Amino acid sequence: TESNKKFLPFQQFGRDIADTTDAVRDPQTLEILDITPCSFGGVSVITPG
Amino acid sequence: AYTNSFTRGVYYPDKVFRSSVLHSTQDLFLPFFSNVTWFHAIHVSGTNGTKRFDNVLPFNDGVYFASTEKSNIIRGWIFGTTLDSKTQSLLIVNNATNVVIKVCEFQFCNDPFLGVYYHKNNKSWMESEFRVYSSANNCTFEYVSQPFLMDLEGKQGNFKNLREFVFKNIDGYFKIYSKHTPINLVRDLPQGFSALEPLVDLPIGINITRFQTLLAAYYVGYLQPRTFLLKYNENGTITDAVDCALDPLSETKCTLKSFTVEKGIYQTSNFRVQPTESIVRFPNITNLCPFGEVFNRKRISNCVADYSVLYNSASFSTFKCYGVSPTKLNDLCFTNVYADSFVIRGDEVRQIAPGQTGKIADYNYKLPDDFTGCVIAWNSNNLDYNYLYRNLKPFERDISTEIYNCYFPLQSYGFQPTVGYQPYRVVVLSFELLHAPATVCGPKKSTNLVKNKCVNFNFNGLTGTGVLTESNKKFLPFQQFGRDIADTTDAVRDPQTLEILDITPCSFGGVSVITPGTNTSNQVAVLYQDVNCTEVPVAIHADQLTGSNVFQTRAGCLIGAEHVNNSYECDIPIGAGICAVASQSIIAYTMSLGAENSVAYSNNSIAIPTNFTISVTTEILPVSMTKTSVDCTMYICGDSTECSNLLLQYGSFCTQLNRALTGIAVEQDKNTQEVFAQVKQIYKTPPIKDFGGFNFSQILPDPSKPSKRSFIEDLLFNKVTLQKFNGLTVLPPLLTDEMIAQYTSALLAGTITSGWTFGAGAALQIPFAMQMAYRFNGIGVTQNVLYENQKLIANQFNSAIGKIQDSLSSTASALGKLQDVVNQNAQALNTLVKQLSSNFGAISSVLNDILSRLDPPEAEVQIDRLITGRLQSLQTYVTQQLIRAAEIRASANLAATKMSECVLGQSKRVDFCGKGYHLMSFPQSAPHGVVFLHVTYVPAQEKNFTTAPAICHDGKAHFPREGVFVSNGTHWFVTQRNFYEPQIITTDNTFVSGNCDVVIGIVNNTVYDP
Amino acid sequence: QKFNGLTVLPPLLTDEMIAQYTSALLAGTITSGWTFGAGAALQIPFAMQMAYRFNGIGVTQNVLYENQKLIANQFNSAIGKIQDSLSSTASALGKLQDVVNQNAQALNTLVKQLSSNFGAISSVLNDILSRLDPPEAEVQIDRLITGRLQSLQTYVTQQLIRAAEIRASANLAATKMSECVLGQSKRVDF
Amino acid sequence: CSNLLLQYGSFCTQLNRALTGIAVEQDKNTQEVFAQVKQIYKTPPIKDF
Amino acid sequence: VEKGIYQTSNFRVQPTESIVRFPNITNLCPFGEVFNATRFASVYAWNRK
């Protein structure tokens, strides 16, 4: 996903609170681009009996 | 000239970026508030000639260097250890259009800047020439970037700016930070707060403690391995930072995880006294063991020997007998000497060894597995043959080899060594585990002993810290070192003069903080627990003469406030009944738990009130929790094969947790339910807002903008400070907040619009007036006066309500009892995830990383370590969450009850829902909880009256039908017992009990009838 | 009491202040009764308020006014009836000493754990760090620390559990003193 | 000892804080057990009950 | 099965076509003057580079 934060040369990756890494540099053009855990949840069934 | 740094020495840890979060760090940092040597020119020089008196410092855990010369007069930083052609020397200097990094050998430099510029005419004249290097024969390397075009932009700032140029050698990868900090200044302002980026990391890893800086005027520091708490900003800069460990405020901050310290008391740590000049005591004998046929089957003893030169006898490469740490073993003290040496060969080391198996073991020789050393290499068949071995267990011999028929018996290790049985005569370790007198170790300096001062001892090889008292315990002839209980050694009997001593733990205890709050936290008051704190001499006199004295209690000494004999309340706990403010400072004192008094007593006068007030209060109950939900599989795996394999290695455990946790989810929603599922139909207040003077505009959710909410609810929400990541989530609360609102509105409406009867059947509608009347009679007070006071009562009501409103708005922390619940929840989840930082002595904290680090096999058990760590951790959280569940559930049914009992009806059990004679209570809503308000009927403005326990008239003894007598001296009256209300005495309001006979206090007054 | 790696910290209130709170409650109940439950202690003469209590139990106070003396005597005798029967027969502190021992026993269990090696060669980590190289002994240290670790952890847990039970009981106790001191419920068995 | 502890997360502080929690809880227990009257009331020397 | 929900498993929106990236562009250091210059070194001129 889009990356709106900004860095410096001393800044390659920036994780956020709970220190979770998400800010990939994208070294081919030097445009950081952020990431996100591709979500999911539990599953189950509903049965009356 | 020493100068004190306000705020210098700040630089980021790595390529890490954060935002608005407080994070740790640690390295050689410029410690805050230290000395800095500042100077300009000790003698007039640098403009023509060179003068001075004496002469550049070394490196004491990192180097920091800069100045203010709007010029390259700061010419070079010189990093190395010898600074000649013997060690390559690192110089980093501008190249006048660029900058270059060099590490070659040469003589010396000179003045790169003389000051006199603009030459002397239109062109060069090139007289002032300048030099750095010499004789380029031995050169190692050079580097070019553009620091002059990157770092030194000292232009358009005609003079006087302020940069900084620090250096760090962090595990060889030679990193250097920088920043051209502009600060418009004039003179003598070493202030300015910023950070640094690594311009260059030359991965050299070379011998670095010398930084000869050459051109008189230069600032030097010497960094310090302190860990500090930083805060970043989304822009990436730093706003402020502290060391974790400089000042007894610094730790407070570093641990409570806030740039702000609130009111309270926060135990940070304790203290370990630095002992003085550890002692050494070993016996007097000095002689070694036999080595006739060893260097230069039997045993021998009496060896206290220097194992150095004939332990690492160069017949090996170095003395490496598995089972041996010659690094240390020379320093320990022993009790035995067992040296077994029997003819075997020495090219069969692995054969003859622990892990023994073979005819050597059973037939001939295999001593049991005990921690041992090994034997050394040599020639013996052809350096001195027909020599033989000996199924059988160790320690055993046999002469005439009876049948075991058999084969050709003997076997020889001859002068035909080419072969895998070269000759060593096996040698053995000796070692015993404390089970006996202490006698044996190779004597070193063997110091003389001290006493009565908590100092460490390596006493006869057995080590420990504490104090040394002459043990009055009369030992018995058979004692070398004892233990009170469970590791607590006591006996200290010297190995030379055989004198016995004692040990205690030299006292210590927590250190905490007692402060009012951050914005006053200048006077951090420190504490030490229960000690005659004469070992912390650095602030007692600083607090014996801002600062008044040093006062100790039965809770310990308190350096950080003083004593006062006033009698005030208890704000902050300290210990031992001494709480916290007054006179505009911090202090300590003893507690006046109240205005020490007592109203007078009489046996003829009672204290009946005349007036009263209704009053409102608040009680905030946690009811719920984010019904978290977790999964073993993903958590430990995050889509990982090896991981899930190794988890279903562990049976159903993780599954059990999931299931029990979901159980708690179920129970908690049921909590909510039983909290509100108290009527089945749902209701809406009539739009008819006709409540006989009773206002509720903050409460009754008429169609306001936000659906059907309460003004109070809005005030509530953001008054609570209130996101999922991975590994866990929050299955949403079942009962939606709005559903709760509706429950509440309807439930709250019916009771105040239908009496209590709805809990009793149909919601039999009710007028509010008659309602309150019934309530009053319920608490013992007659509805007559209520029907008197309608207007004023309702006004006091409304005013109380508005007071509760502004109280909520202007009483912070009044939601502590629930903000705390959500806090415990959150921070629990927080540490839960944060665990995954913990790598548990792996190489990594991401299982992916470490499996990619190794080949399968060793990574297997390594991942198992990961597994067990993360496993126990999540397991812990499981438990602890379970426990909060326990408490929240207790509280839960407690609540659900409360609502059920002090709303739907009218209790009498005080304190439950009313601070006195209790009328009733209103319900509410809250983020993860509930809150209720109440109306208590509090008496006030009492009066004294003459009071008789019984009356006699016509001899007959007339008791109160129900009430107390009362007389204002002149006339007697009968009255209800919770409000002054005299009444006339006739046959009804007083029955009788025989003639006035026996009871004490019966007065003379006739009863009447109209 | 305090040995190493453990501690005790004083009850914020000391006995003195406690007994003082008590004394106050006693006399007030003896003298002002219900009123202090709501605020201003408004004094009352004891006989009449016991008579009100007899109202509450289900009898007209008149009984008291005829019986008081023997009531008195009975009361008074009844009073001593306990302390003697307490001074003579011990073991009356049952649950007291029960939670007491549970705690202290537990604490010693905690320390006794330290006298277990968990398979590592050592019982005192100093011994192992000394007798060989740390780069090796680290593993025995890990065994030791994990063992003592989980042990401590347990201790925490069960201590918490007793905390919870104590806790709920304490709330019960507060209510007990509440509606069994500042006034008389009809909650039988309460 | 702590040299190798510090590679084991923060259980340490976890239990520290929880236990100290149970302490402050027991304190507040005593409070809610007793601090139920505003002043500190004194019995009268007169004793004629 | 009995009347109720029961979480049976989860799912992961399966990521597609793992790639890998790294440091700017991919190049080599000066081997032309090591393998395409017309002069070289001799028995007596070779330096261990």
Ligand SMILES: *[C@@H]1O[C@H](CO)[C@@H](O[C@@H]2O[C@H](CO)[C@@H](O[C@@H]3O[C@H](CO[C@H]4O[C@H](CO)[C@@H](O)[C@H](O)[C@@H]4O)[C@@H](O)[C@H](O)[C@@H]3O)[C@H](O)[C@H]2NC(C)=O)[C@H](O)[C@H]1NC(C)=O
């Ligand atoms: C907060 O972090 C930001 C990075 O995440 C910092 O960078 C800022 O990023 C914006 C991006 O649009 C830049 O905005 C540009 O502004 C110029 C005009 O510059 C104005 O500001 C300077 C400041 O001295 C002022 O002197 C000028 O007269 C202008 O008024 C526009 O022409 C562009 O189109 C663009 O909108 C910021 O300039 C940029 N700031 C810096 C310092 O790089 C941001 O600075 C951080 N804010 C803090 C730390 O307070």
Ligand SMILES: *[C@@H]1O[C@H](CO)[C@@H](O[C@@H]2O[C@H](CO)[C@@H](O[C@@H]3O[C@H](CO)[C@@H](O)[C@H](O)[C@@H]3O)[C@H](O)[C@H]2NC(C)=O)[C@H](O)[C@H]1NC(C)=O
């Ligand atoms: C290594 O990193 C450098 C710097 O990021 C890469 O050079 C950059 O290449 C991109 C794409 O060609 C350039 O963006 C382009 O700019 C032109 C205008 O100059 C514009 O018309 C294109 O649409 C696009 O936006 C970028 O400017 C350029 N940066 C620099 C400093 O040259 C380089 O490509 C990376 N490695 C290689 C060569 O693959």
Ligand SMILES: *[C@@H]1O[C@H](CO)[C@@H](O[C@@H]2O[C@H](CO)[C@@H](O)[C@H](O)[C@H]2NC(C)=O)[C@H](O)[C@H]1NC(C)=O
């Ligand atoms: C009981 O206390 C209240 C609280 O002050 C008294 O309030 C009276 O309120 C009316 C209505 O606003 C005022 O005009 C009077 O001035 C207040 N009383 C006095 C004495 O000034 C109330 O009078 C008190 N007594 C009763 C019987 O309610």
Ligand SMILES: *[C@@H]1O[C@H](CO)[C@@H](O[C@@H]2O[C@H](CO)[C@@H](O)[C@H](O)[C@H]2NC(C)=O)[C@H](O)[C@H]1NC(C)=O
């Ligand atoms: C109940 O009190 C609230 C204020 O807390 C009243 O709401 C507003 O009160 C102000 C009085 O200063 C009026 O000017 C506004 O018109 C009120 N807002 C309305 C009516 O929407 C509310 O009116 C009070 N209700 C009664 C019956 O007095």
Ligand SMILES: *[C@@H]1O[C@H](CO)[C@@H](O[C@@H]2O[C@H](CO)[C@@H](O)[C@H](O)[C@H]2NC(C)=O)[C@H](O)[C@H]1NC(C)=O
């Ligand atoms: C009711 O209040 C009055 C107001 O003072 C009390 O009056 C004082 O009582 C003490 C009791 O010993 C006397 O010594 C004072 O001289 C009294 N003062 C006045 C002005 O008379 C009265 O005592 C209180 N009721 C009772 C039963 O004590």
Ligand SMILES: *[C@@H]1O[C@H](CO)[C@@H](O[C@@H]2O[C@H](CO)[C@@H](O)[C@H](O)[C@H]2NC(C)=O)[C@H](O)[C@H]1NC(C)=O
């Ligand atoms: C209260 O009034 C009663 C009469 O109603 C008084 O009773 C008599 O008092 C005299 C005084 O000695 C006794 O001898 C009589 O026996 C009493 N009457 C009866 C029927 O026994 C009584 O004295 C008055 N109270 C006081 C304190 O004098």
Ligand SMILES: *[C@@H]1O[C@H](CO)[C@@H](O)[C@H](O)[C@H]1NC(C)=O
């Ligand atoms: C420097 O000092 C010398 C000796 O005093 C003097 O001759 C000279 O003029 C001074 N300055 C220069 C630029 O030579």
Ligand SMILES: *[C@@H]1O[C@H](CO)[C@@H](O)[C@H](O)[C@H]1NC(C)=O
């Ligand atoms: C550098 O000095 C050493 C002397 O130790 C010498 O062997 C070497 O040849 C010198 N380097 C060059 C390039 O000559």
Ligand SMILES: *[C@@H]1O[C@H](CO)[C@@H](O)[C@H](O)[C@H]1NC(C)=O
């Ligand atoms: C200098 O660096 C070398 C590089 O391997 C290292 O082995 C050596 O111990 C260092 N010298 C000192 C005195 O630390």
Ligand SMILES: *[C@@H]1O[C@H](CO)[C@@H](O)[C@H](O)[C@H]1NC(C)=O
């Ligand atoms: C033991 O050695 C000390 C010196 O180390 C010496 O003074 C003393 O006489 C010796 N003998 C005894 C019994 O202490």
Ligand SMILES: *[C@@H]1O[C@H](CO)[C@@H](O)[C@H](O)[C@H]1NC(C)=O
């Ligand atoms: C500290 O800050 C709070 C924040 O509201 C403020 O109310 C309080 O007055 C401040 N303390 C002092 C001593 O000024």
Ligand SMILES: *[C@@H]1O[C@H](CO)[C@@H](O)[C@H](O)[C@H]1NC(C)=O
């Ligand atoms: C302080 O010193 C005295 C010496 O008179 C000592 O008895 C006392 O124990 C010391 N304080 C404490 C808290 O032990």
Ligand SMILES: *[C@@H]1O[C@H](CO)[C@@H](O)[C@H](O)[C@H]1NC(C)=O
């Ligand atoms: C109590 O404190 C006061 C402070 O004003 C001091 O003067 C006095 O000596 C102390 N001790 C007493 C009153 O016994």
Ligand SMILES: *[C@@H]1O[C@H](CO)[C@@H](O)[C@H](O)[C@H]1NC(C)=O
């Ligand atoms: C209470 O009655 C007893 C006995 O009649 C007496 O000691 C006491 O004086 C009476 N109370 C007052 C306030 O006089």
Ligand SMILES: *[C@@H]1O[C@H](CO)[C@@H](O)[C@H](O)[C@H]1NC(C)=O
């Ligand atoms: C006592 O109460 C009566 C009411 O029956 C009243 O008339 C009389 O004035 C009161 N006495 C005094 C002294 O106020």
